[PDB]
Antibody, heavy 218, light 211 residues
Framework: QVQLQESGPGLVKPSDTLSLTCAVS?????????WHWIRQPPGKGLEWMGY???????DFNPSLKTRITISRDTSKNQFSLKLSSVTAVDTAVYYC???????????WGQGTLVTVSSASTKGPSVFPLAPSSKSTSGGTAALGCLVKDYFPEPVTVSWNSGALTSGVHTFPAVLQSSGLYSLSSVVTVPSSSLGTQTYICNVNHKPSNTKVDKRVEP | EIVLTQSPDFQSVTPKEKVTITCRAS??????LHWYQQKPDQSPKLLIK???HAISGVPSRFSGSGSGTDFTLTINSLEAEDAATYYC?????????FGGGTKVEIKRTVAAPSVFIFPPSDEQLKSGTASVVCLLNNFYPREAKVQWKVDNALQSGNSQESVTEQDSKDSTYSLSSTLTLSKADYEKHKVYACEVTHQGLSSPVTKSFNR
């Protein structure tokens, strides 16, 4: 088990330079293999960016070479990525990946999304979608969170700290006319559980440092 | 720059059926082609190596074959599990390259939307705007139409939809339509209706509320 974990500011302004680090745990970046950066534009497909070898040797994809560098801290078990003079084309999800000689990628990080705009971060407001039924109905009721007026992507929504998983649908964010994002998260429950159990949405927007719990009740 | 071209680009497969996917390289990479699966919001998952070798911890379901310029991946028995998009990758020379992907959708039986309507909360309301949302839960196919009615006046250009990804267990879609109005505009009216038109629904459904 290796573990790749990328961090970096998720919003960087255009013409500025994007910096990302991959913390690697459970294996040594100087032990072997190659350490790669790959990005995926939203809606698009994977573009391979460059890499650094266990030796410290690096190489890159052209169409990026003249604006991109990659370095490492062996003392910290991390390699890094610098992409200068950034434009909207660079709005993507960035992945850490450890490549074998195959040369295939068995291990990847979760991906971190960087979006490139001059616009400011906006923490969201959270409103409840009251359950469709009472606890004496005896069928299924639906209740949700509505996360509204935030920038940038992404926001994360779980129910009851993550104990509640089944029947949960989180809709992709929809870019509003004000250029602010917005989504809803809904859950369907047996109606009888409305009088026996409390549903909380946990809404999480790192870029504004916002963590909100909303108790959804009638 | 070896360029890779996959086929098809989108594909609709009935459950428990075979999915074939093909790559066409621009020169002979022989052995050196891998296949990844990517469900949405997740990192890709290696499926096939070299280009017919199986990964450990990967269903016997999946398999690959091909050489030089043409390669084929096959899922022998489509499972809901397999609602992803498939990539091939070339390992013959740098730069490293992936195909455009192949979205595979699972064509399950028709399901009918479960419709729900939600008044805007009084916290949001007290803040000037009112959002009324209509949840169409668990349906197939993806296609459906949602008509807002306010006091029977047909609303246009003030709504917005979002549609979820294909469920990985029952393979159905959910939809959300959001009507946004001014708080002033909100109580100039009494009835609010989400009218739903869909294939699995013999006649259109309307869900509403008052006050």
């Amino acid at each position: 088990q290796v573990q790749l974990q990328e961090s970096g500011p998720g919003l960087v302004k255009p013409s500025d330079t994007l910096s990302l680090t991959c913390a690697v745990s459970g294996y040594s970046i100087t032990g072997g293999y190659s350490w790669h950066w790959i990005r995926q534009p939203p809606g698009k497909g994977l573009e391979w960016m460059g890499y650094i070898h266990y030796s410290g040797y690096t190489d890159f994809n052209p169409s990026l070479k003249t604006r991109i560098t990659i370095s490492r801290d062996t003392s910290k078990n991390q390699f890094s990525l610098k992409l200068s003079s950034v434009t909207a084309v660079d709005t993507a999800v960035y992945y850490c990946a450890r490549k074998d000689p195959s040369d295939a990628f068995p291990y990847w990080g979760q991906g971190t999304l960087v979006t490139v705009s001059s616009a400011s971060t906006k923490g969201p407001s959270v409103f409840p979608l009251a359950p469709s039924s009472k606890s004496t109905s005896g069928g299924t009721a639906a209740l949700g969170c509505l996360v509204k007026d935030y920038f940038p992507e992404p926001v994360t929504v779980s129910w009851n700290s993550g104990a509640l998983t089944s029947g949960v649908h989180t809709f992709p964010a929809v870019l509003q006319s004000s250029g602010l994002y917005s989504l809803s998260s809904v859950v369907t429950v047996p109606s009888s559980s409305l009088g026996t159990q409390t549903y909380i949405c946990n809404v999480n927007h790192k870029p504004s440092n916002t963590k909100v719990d909303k108790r959804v009740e009638p | 720059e070896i360029v890779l071209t996959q086929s098809p680009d989108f594909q609709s497969v009935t459950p428990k059926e075979k999915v074939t996917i093909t790559c066409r390289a621009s020169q002979s990479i022989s052995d050196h082609l891998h296949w990844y699966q990517q469900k949405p919001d997740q990192s890709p998952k290696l499926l096939i190596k070299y280009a017919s070798h199986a990964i450990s911890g990967v269903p016997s379901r999946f398999s690959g074959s091909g050489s030089g310029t043409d390669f084929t991946l096959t899922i022998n028995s489509l499972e809901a599990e397999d609602a992803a998009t498939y990539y091939c990758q070339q390992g013959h020379s740098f730069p490293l390259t992936f195909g455009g992907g192949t979205k595979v959708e699972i064509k399950r039986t028709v399901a009918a939307p479960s419709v729900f309507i939600f008044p805007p909360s009084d916290e949001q309301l007290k803040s000037g705007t009112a959002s009324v949302v209509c949840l169409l839960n668990n349906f197939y196919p993806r296609e459906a139409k949602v008509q807002w009615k306010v006091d029977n006046a047909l609303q246009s250009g003030n709504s917005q939809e979002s549609v979820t990804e294909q469920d990985s267990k029952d393979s159905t879609y959910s939809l959300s339509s959001t009507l946004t109005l001014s708080k002033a505009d909100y109580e100039k009216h009494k009835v609010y209706a989400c009218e739903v038109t869909h294939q699995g629904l013999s006649s259109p459904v309307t869900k509403s509320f008052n006050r």
